Design a protein. Structure first.
Lengths: 350, 49, 49, 47, 45, 49, 49, 49
C-alpha cells in the first residue's frame, strides 16, 4: 500500500520492467501495424463488502491441490496429531481374505489374514479409512534398534487417541501387519500416500480430513488465519539420513523417500517404516538399499519396497531435532522445513 | 423452372417441371505463426531496462 | 475458498460462529405431541445366529 | 467481439441468481442451527 | 422422443411468474424437457 | 404448406429472500457479529449467583 | 361472504400480425409476443442487470 | 429455481439448483349438428314459391 521500499517493492506485489513492458505494449502507440514513415455496524458491514470489493479490483505464489476425504476415526486420529503430519490412505479391506489365498507361496497359512483382520474390526468397534503416520510407528516399534524413542511413540498413543484401548488395536494392527508379510499380501501394496495435514473437521465416529496432495507445505490456507503456517514433523525412529552416513557433505536439493523393510521367516517377521532423506536419483537408490538392508536380504525374494515422497528445494536442506509434546509425552521428532510434495509409485526388488 | 416443348401423339404429354436444390456451406481456415524470442519479451516487458 | 474442478470453479463460503447458552437451569422444553406412521412393521421375524 | 454482448448478460445474471441463492443459504442457515441447538438443551416435559 | 431444450433467450423475458414453489423433480412426468443444473452450466451459454 | 411451432410464453420464479431477523425465532438468539473471530481463541463468559 | 362477484369480460387474442408472422413463414417458428421479446433483447444488451 | 439452506459439515456442501422444463399443448375440438329439412331447402332457395 505505497510504502517507501520503492526499489524492489513493485517486484514483490506481483515490478519495474513490467511498467516498461507495458510501456511499449500499452502506453505507445497507434501500432498494431501502422503506416509508413449505525455507528459500528455500517460501516462495519460496508467495510466488509469493501474487503470483498478489493479482491475484485485485482485478479509469486505456487499452486496447490487440496483434497478432502471424510474418514472414520478408528485407526487414525487427526485430533491428537497436529497439523503437519504424513497421512497414509488404504485400500478396501474385504479383498484381503481372498488375495491371501492365491499370492501365498505353498506351505503358508492363507487363513491368517482373514482372522487377524477379523479381530481388528472386532477391536476397533470396542470402508477405505485412513491411518496416520504416527499411529503406524508404534506398531512397527518392536523392530527398531535404539528402541527408547520407539516406546515413546507408543506412550502417547494409548493415552491420547480417540478410541478405547488403541494399544489393543496396536497389538492387533501390528498383528495385522505381521499377517500381511506372512500371507504374501505385502503392506506396501495397500498403503497409499495422502497429503500432509492442513486441517480436519471431526464429528461423531468420523472426521473430514483436508490435505495437500501436491504442492508446498508452509503457505497453505490452514483455515485459521491467525496461524497460517504448518511444518512437517517426523519421529526420530523412522528418520534416516544418507548424507552423513556416507560423508556426503556436498550441498544440493534433497529428496524424500518412504522405505519399507520386509523380513520373511517362519513366525519371526518384523515390520519397519522408514522415511529416507537423500540427494540420490531414484535410479541410484536400490544400491543403497543393498548396502544398509542387505542384512535382511540374506535372511530372505523382495526385501525392500520404496516410494517417492517429495523434494526439499533448498541448496542446503535444513533439519531440526526437537521433542514436541503429544499431549503429555515428549517424543524426539525430526523437523523438516520447506517440503514440496510430489508423490510417486512403488517398487519391488525380488 | 424448366421449359417444355409441345409434341403430337401418341407420345404421352409432358408437363411443366420445376427444380429445387439447396447446398451446404463448407468451412475452412488459415494459419500463420508469429513467434517471438525471450530477450524480446524482457525488453518489451520493461524488465531489462 | 477457490478450488477448481471439472473445468468449473468452486467457491465455498464459510461463516465461523460461536454459541453460548447463557441460561442457567433448563431454558427450553420439547414435548411430543402426536404420532405418525410407526416405521417398523411390528412383525414376527426370528433371529438367526 | 456482435452476439457475444448478448451472451455476457446471459452469463452475468447466472451470477446474480447464484449470488443470491447462496447468501440466502446463510439466513435460512442460521434458523436451522438454532433448532438443532435448542433441541439439545431441551429435555422433554414428562421428564 | 423429441425433447427440445427450452429457449433461454425467450425465457430471459418471462411473460408471468410462477407462484408456488416445490421440489419439481419429485414429479417429472408432467413435463417433457426437464433439466437440473448445479449453480451454473456450460451449455446455457 | 405452412407449419410452425410456438412458445406461448415463459414463466420464471422469484426466490423468496428471508432475513432471519424477520422470523419469530429471532427472539431466542442474541446475535452480535464479530468482524474478527477466527483469530480468537476460547472466549469465556462469566456468571455470578 | 358475498353474493355478486366482479368478473372480467373479454378473452385474450394472439394474432400473428407483424414480424412474428414472417418468422412463421420464413423461419418456420413463432414466439408469443415477439414484438417485445425482440425488443428487450436490445435494451438489455446495453443497459444493466 | 430452488432456494438453499447452508449446513455444517461433514455434510458435503450443496449448491444452487435450477429446474428447467417445458410443457406441450394438447389439442381438442367440439361438435354440434344443425340439420335442416328437405322442403326447407326449397323454400329458402325459393324453388317452391
Amino acid at each position: 500500500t505505497k510504502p517507501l521500499p520503492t526499489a524492489p517493492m513493485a517486484w514483490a506485489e506481483s515490478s519495474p520492467r513490467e511498467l516498461a513492458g507495458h510501456a511499449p505494449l500499452r502506453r505507445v502507440l497507434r501500432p498494431p501495424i501502422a503506416r509508413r514513415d449505525t455507528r459500528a455496524t455500517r460501516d462495519d458491514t460496508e467495510q466488509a463488502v469493501d474487503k470483498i470489493l478489493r479482491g475484485a479490483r485485482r485478479a509469486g505464489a505456487p499452486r496447490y491441490h487440496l483434497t478432502r476425504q471424510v474418514t472414520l476415526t478408528d485407526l487414525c486420529q487427526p485430533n491428537a496429531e497436529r497439523a503437519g503430519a504424513l497421512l497414509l490412505a488404504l485400500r478396501h479391506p474385504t479383498d484381503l481374505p481372498h488375495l491371501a489365498r492365491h499370492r501365498a507361496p505353498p506351505g503358508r497359512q492363507t487363513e491368517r489374514l482373514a482372522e487377524a483382520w477379523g479381530q481388528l474390526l472386532e477391536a476397533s468397534a470396542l470402508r477405505a479409512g485412513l491411518v496416520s503416520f504416527n499411529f503406524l510407528v508404534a506398531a512397527c516399534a518392536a523392530a527398531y534398534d535404539a528402541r527408547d524413542a520407539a516406546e515413546a511413540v507408543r506412550a502417547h498413543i494409548t493415552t491420547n487417541y480417540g478410541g478405547t484401548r488403541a494399544g489393543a488395536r496396536l497389538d492387533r494392527f501390528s498383528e495385522c501387519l505381521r499377517a500381511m508379510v506372512h500371507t504374501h499380501v505385502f503392506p506396501h501394496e495397500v498403503m497409499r500416500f495422502f497429503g500432509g495435514l492442513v486441517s480436519w473437521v471431526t464429528q461423531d465416529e468420523l472426521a473430514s480430513v483436508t490435505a495437500v496432495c501436491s504442492g508446498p507445505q508452509e503457505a497453505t490456507h490452514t483455515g485459521h488465519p491467525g496461524r497460517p503456517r504448518s511444518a512437517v514433523t517426523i519421529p526420530a525412529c523412522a528418520f534416516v539420513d544418507l548424507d552423513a552416513e556416507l560423508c556426503l557433505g556436498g550441498p544440493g536439493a534433497a529428496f524424500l523417500y518412504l522405505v519399507f523393510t520386509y523380513r520373511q521367516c517362519r513366525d519371526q517377521e518384523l515390520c519397519c517404516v522408514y522415511v529416507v532423506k537423500s540427494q540420490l536419483p531414484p535410479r541410484g537408490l536400490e544400491a543403497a538399499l543393498e548396502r544398509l538392508f542387505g542384512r535382511l536380504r540374506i535372511t530372505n525374494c523382495t526385501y525392500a519396497a520404496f516410494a517417492e515422497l517429495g523434494v526439499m528445494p533448498d541448496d542446503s536442506p535444513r533439519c531440526l531435532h526437537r521433542t514436541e509434546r503429544f499431549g503429555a509425552v515428549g517424543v524426539p521428532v525430526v523437523i523438516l522445513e520447506g517440503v514440496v510434495w510430489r508423490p510417486g509409485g512403488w517398487r519391488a526388488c525380488a | 423452372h424448366q421449359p417444355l416443348i409441345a409434341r403430337d401423339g401418341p407420345h404421352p404429354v409432358e408437363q411443366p417441371v420445376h427444380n429445387y436444390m439447396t447446398k451446404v456451406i463448407d468451412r475452412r481456415a488459415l494459419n500463420a505463426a508469429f513467434s517471438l524470442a525471450t530477450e524480446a519479451i524482457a525488453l518489451l516487458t520493461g524488465e531489462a531496462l | 475458498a477457490r478450488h477448481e474442478t471439472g473445468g468449473g470453479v468452486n467457491f465455498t463460503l464459510t461463516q465461523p460462529r460461536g454459541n453460548v447458552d447463557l441460561g442457567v437451569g433448563y431454558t427450553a422444553v420439547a414435548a411430543t405431541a402426536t404420532v405418525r406412521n410407526p416405521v417398523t412393521d411390528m412383525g414376527n421375524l426370528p433371529q438367526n445366529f | 467481439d456482435g452476439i457475444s454482448l448478448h451472451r455476457q448478460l446471459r452469463a452475468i445474471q447466472q451470477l446474480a441468481r447464484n449470488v443470491q441463492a447462496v447468501l440466502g443459504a446463510f439466513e435460512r442457515g442460521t434458523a436451522d442451527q438454532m433448532l438443532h441447538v435448542l433441541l439439545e438443551k431441551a429435555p422433554p416435559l414428562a421428564l | 422422443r423429441d425433447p427440445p431444450g427450452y429457449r433461454y433467450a425467450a425465457a430471459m423475458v418471462p411473460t408471468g411468474s410462477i407462484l408456488s414453489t416445490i421440489e419439481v423433480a419429485s414429479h417429472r412426468r408432467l413435463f417433457d424437457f426437464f433439466a437440473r443444473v448445479r449453480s451454473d452450466e456450460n451449455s446455457l451459454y | 404448406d405452412v407449419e410452425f411451432d410456438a412458445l406461448l410464453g415463459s414463466y420464471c420464479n422469484t426466490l423468496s429472500l428471508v432475513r432471519f431477523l424477520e422470523l419469530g425465532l429471532s427472539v431466542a438468539c442474541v446475535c452480535t457479529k464479530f468482524p474478527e473471530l477466527a483469530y480468537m481463541n476460547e472466549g469465556r463468559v462469566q456468571f455470578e449467583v | 361472504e358475498d353474493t355478486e362477484a366482479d368478473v372480467p369480460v373479454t378473452y385474450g387474442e394472439m394474432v400473428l400480425n407483424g414480424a412474428n408472422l414472417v418468422t412463421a413463414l420464413v423461419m418456420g417458428k413463432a414466439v408469443r409476443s415477439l414484438d417485445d421479446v425482440g425488443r428487450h433483447l436490445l435494451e438489455m444488451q446495453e443497459e444493466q442487470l
